[PDB]
Enzyme design. Structure first.
Site, PDB file in Angstrom:
ATOM      1  N   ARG A 184      12.717 -20.126  15.095  1.00 35.15           N
ATOM      2  CA  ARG A 184      13.934 -20.868  14.700  1.00 35.15           C
ATOM      3  C   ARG A 184      14.298 -21.841  15.799  1.00 35.15           C
ATOM      4  O   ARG A 184      15.355 -21.742  16.424  1.00 35.15           O
ATOM      5  CB  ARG A 184      15.028 -19.887  14.302  1.00 35.15           C
ATOM      6  CG  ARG A 184      14.720 -19.050  13.062  1.00 35.15           C
ATOM      7  CD  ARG A 184      15.752 -18.001  12.808  1.00 35.15           C
ATOM      8  NE  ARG A 184      15.927 -17.079  13.937  1.00 35.15           N
ATOM      9  CZ  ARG A 184      15.103 -16.130  14.355  1.00 35.15           C
ATOM     10  NH1 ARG A 184      14.047 -15.755  13.647  1.00 35.15           N
ATOM     11  NH2 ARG A 184      15.293 -15.590  15.584  1.00 35.15           N
ATOM     12  N   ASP A 200      10.986 -10.396  16.985  1.00 34.76           N
ATOM     13  CA  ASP A 200      11.525 -11.254  15.969  1.00 34.76           C
ATOM     14  C   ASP A 200      11.431 -10.893  14.542  1.00 34.76           C
ATOM     15  O   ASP A 200      11.484 -11.920  13.724  1.00 34.76           O
ATOM     16  CB  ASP A 200      11.303 -12.732  16.367  1.00 34.76           C
ATOM     17  CG  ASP A 200      12.313 -13.644  15.705  1.00 34.76           C
ATOM     18  OD1 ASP A 200      13.500 -13.328  15.781  1.00 34.76           O
ATOM     19  OD2 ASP A 200      11.976 -14.604  14.987  1.00 34.76           O
ATOM     20  N   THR A 201      10.768  -9.895  14.049  1.00 30.66           N
ATOM     21  CA  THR A 201      10.614  -9.645  12.600  1.00 30.66           C
ATOM     22  C   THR A 201      11.554  -8.565  12.053  1.00 30.66           C
ATOM     23  O   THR A 201      12.419  -8.802  11.215  1.00 30.66           O
ATOM     24  CB  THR A 201       9.115  -9.362  12.211  1.00 30.66           C
ATOM     25  OG1 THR A 201       8.683  -8.297  13.107  1.00 30.66           O
ATOM     26  CG2 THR A 201       8.188 -10.579  12.267  1.00 30.66           C
ATOM     27  N   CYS A 237      -0.472  -8.444   7.617  1.00 27.53           N
ATOM     28  CA  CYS A 237       0.243  -7.899   8.731  1.00 27.53           C
ATOM     29  C   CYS A 237      -0.116  -6.458   9.063  1.00 27.53           C
ATOM     30  O   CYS A 237       0.048  -5.510   8.301  1.00 27.53           O
ATOM     31  CB  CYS A 237       1.759  -7.988   8.471  1.00 27.53           C
ATOM     32  SG  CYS A 237       2.735  -7.227   9.756  1.00 27.53           S
ATOM     33  N   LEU A 238      -0.542  -6.316  10.315  1.00 34.90           N
ATOM     34  CA  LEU A 238      -0.968  -5.071  10.948  1.00 34.90           C
ATOM     35  C   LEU A 238       0.232  -4.189  11.336  1.00 34.90           C
ATOM     36  O   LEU A 238       0.043  -2.961  11.391  1.00 34.90           O
ATOM     37  CB  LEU A 238      -1.778  -5.471  12.214  1.00 34.90           C
ATOM     38  CG  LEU A 238      -3.155  -6.090  12.052  1.00 34.90           C
ATOM     39  CD1 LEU A 238      -3.615  -6.780  13.338  1.00 34.90           C
ATOM     40  CD2 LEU A 238      -4.162  -4.954  11.771  1.00 34.90           C
ATOM     41  N   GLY A 239       1.317  -4.807  11.710  1.00 27.45           N
ATOM     42  CA  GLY A 239       2.532  -4.081  12.125  1.00 27.45           C
ATOM     43  C   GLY A 239       3.376  -3.596  10.955  1.00 27.45           C
ATOM     44  O   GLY A 239       4.468  -3.068  11.151  1.00 27.45           O
TER      45      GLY A 239
HETATM   46  C1  HEM Z   1       9.825  -7.263   9.021  1.00 25.28           C
HETATM   47  C2  HEM Z   1       8.621  -6.991   9.398  1.00 25.28           C
HETATM   48  C3  HEM Z   1       7.455  -7.990   9.442  1.00 25.28           C
HETATM   49  C4  HEM Z   1       7.117  -8.930   8.565  1.00 25.28           C
HETATM   50  C5  HEM Z   1       7.884  -9.398   7.325  1.00 25.28           C
HETATM   51  C6  HEM Z   1       5.891  -9.570   9.055  1.00 25.28           C
HETATM   52  C7  HEM Z   1       5.227 -10.583   8.418  1.00 25.28           C
HETATM   53  C8  HEM Z   1       3.932 -10.956   8.717  1.00 25.28           C
HETATM   54  C9  HEM Z   1       3.208 -12.014   8.028  1.00 25.28           C
HETATM   55  C10 HEM Z   1       3.741 -12.726   6.777  1.00 25.28           C
HETATM   56  C11 HEM Z   1       1.986 -12.069   8.573  1.00 25.28           C
HETATM   57  C12 HEM Z   1       0.810 -13.006   8.250  1.00 25.28           C
HETATM   58  C13 HEM Z   1       1.015 -14.463   8.671  1.00 25.28           C
HETATM   59  C14 HEM Z   1      -0.073 -15.413   8.245  1.00 25.28           C
HETATM   60  O1  HEM Z   1      -0.891 -15.076   7.352  1.00 25.28           O
HETATM   61  O2  HEM Z   1       0.044 -16.526   8.827  1.00 25.28           O
HETATM   62  C15 HEM Z   1       1.938 -11.120   9.671  1.00 25.28           C
HETATM   63  C16 HEM Z   1       0.847 -10.960  10.509  1.00 25.28           C
HETATM   64  C17 HEM Z   1       0.867 -10.189  11.636  1.00 25.28           C
HETATM   65  N1  HEM Z   1       1.908  -9.365  12.023  1.00 25.28           N
HETATM   66 FE1  HEM Z   1       3.563  -8.933  10.975  1.00 25.28          FE
HETATM   67  N2  HEM Z   1       5.498  -8.979  10.249  1.00 25.28           N
HETATM   68  C18 HEM Z   1       6.464  -8.001  10.505  1.00 25.28           C
HETATM   69  C19 HEM Z   1       6.413  -7.120  11.565  1.00 25.28           C
HETATM   70  C20 HEM Z   1       5.379  -6.998  12.484  1.00 25.28           C
HETATM   71  C21 HEM Z   1       5.334  -6.042  13.579  1.00 25.28           C
HETATM   72  C22 HEM Z   1       6.396  -4.964  13.840  1.00 25.28           C
HETATM   73  C23 HEM Z   1       4.200  -6.277  14.241  1.00 25.28           C
HETATM   74  C24 HEM Z   1       3.596  -5.552  15.479  1.00 25.28           C
HETATM   75  C25 HEM Z   1       4.360  -5.608  16.595  1.00 25.28           C
HETATM   76  C26 HEM Z   1       3.531  -7.420  13.620  1.00 25.28           C
HETATM   77  C27 HEM Z   1       2.284  -7.894  13.956  1.00 25.28           C
HETATM   78  C28 HEM Z   1       1.511  -8.768  13.210  1.00 25.28           C
HETATM   79  C29 HEM Z   1       0.149  -9.160  13.522  1.00 25.28           C
HETATM   80  C30 HEM Z   1      -0.615  -8.662  14.754  1.00 25.28           C
HETATM   81  C31 HEM Z   1      -0.230 -10.056  12.594  1.00 25.28           C
HETATM   82  C32 HEM Z   1      -1.570 -10.800  12.468  1.00 25.28           C
HETATM   83  C33 HEM Z   1      -2.704 -10.174  11.660  1.00 25.28           C
HETATM   84  C34 HEM Z   1      -3.943 -11.052  11.515  1.00 25.28           C
HETATM   85  O3  HEM Z   1      -3.837 -12.262  11.850  1.00 25.28           O
HETATM   86  O4  HEM Z   1      -4.965 -10.545  10.983  1.00 25.28           O
HETATM   87  N3  HEM Z   1       4.258  -7.802  12.498  1.00 25.28           N
HETATM   88  N4  HEM Z   1       3.153 -10.473   9.760  1.00 25.28           N
END
Ligand code: HEM
Length: 405
Positions: free
Chosen positions: A177, A242-243, A348-350
């Site tokens: 943001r 941030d998520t 998303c892994l998290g």
């Molecule tokens: C409200 C919770 C969350 C939402 C809505 C969210 C959403 C997303 C989205 C939409 C993507 C894919 C983005 C793309 O395709 O450009 C993503 C990827 C990812 N997120 Fe989450 N995220 C959240 C929480 C987390 C948490 C808690 C972690 C770990 C600390 C995390 C780690 C990652 C990672 C490592 C990727 C990349 C996976 C890859 O590129 O194969 N996220 N997330």
């Protein structure tokens, strides 16, 4: 500030949406975006804001675009271009097959097994934070719980000092943001000035923290580089900080307003999991994109190599073709269709950690403070960007209606 329409764009496809300052912001963030799904809007539009880019407005197109890495590459996933350009996070700025090796490692750090292991702390920290809040009859949910909860758990996971929170958090915010205070690259640099030393220190003297595991990891039979590690950890931080933070404020804001929804959860706890899914659909908050690797014709629209397109993960589940009465929260929907955690190889892994944090919070908050509402005369403001948020969430409650555990 609308950029001049490129030659290949039919003027009938223009729809000037500003992802950073949508028109209906007052009404709420999900609502401001959903104007993209009205009858007057083509499925695929071009916006002259933020330098000009395509936007896919429908679940079907978003899913397709996400599946197709050949055409729609992750190389420049952020709008505006300078941001997608400066962006070099791993595995997010990579496509398969390369993506896969970094993914596998990142999974080691955030996956299921790690959640299962951290479960007691999650439960411990939540119960603690709430119990602390309970007798006050009032907080700033955003500052009082939404921020601390997920962050402290992250800082725990990463083995980083709680003291770095404020600094870390500022830089993270700048990326999703953008304030205008600093550019994406400047912001990327600072987070990087931060990580560098630590990684070095964990290559020499490894720990059991997430950073140590990343810094000493194996990728395609060989050791990860320092730069690669810097770049994974950079991503981990942004997802960590941030998520979950923002998601919780939307859900809490919603709960404060719907006594009937609170009750259902209180009496039929077996429903928490289904409800978490519904809330993830209704309060979805990520919007990123892809870059066209070439000239390609998609659903009758001619896309030119280098064009960026926004594929708002937020929009799939709000789409009436996917969910009947999308703006309505119903915990007993037969099918909750969303792409909140993304779609395709970048899923998303998290998500597991995130789900555990949400369920714990609902179960635990509801137990102790079953009855709450928004502070009289507080006006809740959303913010839009790559990750949308809530500015502040003033809540009030009668201490006499709380229950200690
Ligand atoms: C409200 C919770 C969350 C939402 C809505 C969210 C959403 C997303 C989205 C939409 C993507 C894919 C983005 C793309 O395709 O450009 C993503 C990827 C990812 N997120 Fe989450 N995220 C959240 C929480 C987390 C948490 C808690 C972690 C770990 C600390 C995390 C780690 C990652 C990672 C490592 C990727 C990349 C996976 C890859 O590129 O194969 N996220 N997330």
């Amino acid at each position: 500030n609308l950029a001049p329409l490129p030659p290949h764009v039919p003027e009938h496809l223009v729809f000037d949406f500003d992802m950073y300052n949508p028109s209906n912001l007052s009404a709420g963030v999900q609502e401001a975006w959903a104007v993209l799904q009205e009858s007057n809007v083509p499925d695929l539009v071009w916006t002259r804001c933020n330098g000009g880019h395509w936007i896919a407005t429908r679940g079907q197109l978003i899913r397709e675009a996400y599946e197709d890495y050949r055409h729609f590459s992750s190389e420049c996933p952020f709008i505006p271009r300078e941001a997608g350009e400066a962006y070099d996070f791993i595995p997010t700025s990579m496509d398969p097959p390369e993506q896969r090796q970094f993914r596998a490692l990142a999974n080691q750090v955030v996956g299921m097994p790690v959640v299962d292991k951290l479960e007691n702390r999650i439960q411990e920290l939540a119960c603690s934070l709430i119990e602390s809040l309970r007798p006050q009859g009032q907080c700033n949910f955003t500052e009082d719980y939404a921020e601390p909860f997920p962050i402290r758990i992250f800082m725990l996971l990463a083995g980083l000092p709680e003291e770095d929170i404020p600094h870390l958090k500022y830089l993270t915010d700048q990326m999703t943001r953008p304030d205008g205070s600093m550019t994406f690259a400047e912001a990327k640099e600072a987070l990087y000035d931060y990580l560098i030393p630590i990684i070095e220190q964990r290559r020499q003297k490894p720990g059991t923290d997430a950073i140590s595991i990343v810094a000493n990891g194996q990728v395609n039979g060989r050791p990860i580089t320092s730069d690669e590690a810097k770049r994974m950890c950079g991503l981990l931080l942004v997802g960590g900080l941030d998520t979950v933070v923002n998601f919780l404020s939307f859900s809490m804001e919603f709960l404060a307003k719907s006594p009937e929804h609170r009750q259902e959860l209180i009496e039929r706890p077996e429903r928490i999991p289904a409800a978490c899914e519904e809330l993830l659909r209704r309060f979805s908050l990520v919007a990123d994109g892809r870059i066209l690797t070439s000239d390609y014709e998609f659903h009758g629209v001619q896309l030119k190599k280098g064009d960026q397109i926004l594929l708002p993960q937020m929009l799939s589940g709000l789409d009436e073709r996917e969910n009947a009465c999308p703006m309505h929260v119903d915990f007993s929907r037969q099918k909750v269709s969303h792409t909140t955690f993304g779609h395709g190889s970048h899923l998303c892994l998290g998500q597991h950690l995130a789900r555990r944090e949400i369920i714990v919070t609902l179960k635990e908050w509801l137990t102790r403070i079953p009855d709450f509402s928004i502070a009289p005369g507080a006006q809740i403001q959303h913010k839009s960007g790559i990750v949308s948020g809530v500015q502040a969430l003033p809540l009030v409650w009668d201490p006499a209606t709380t229950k200690a555990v």
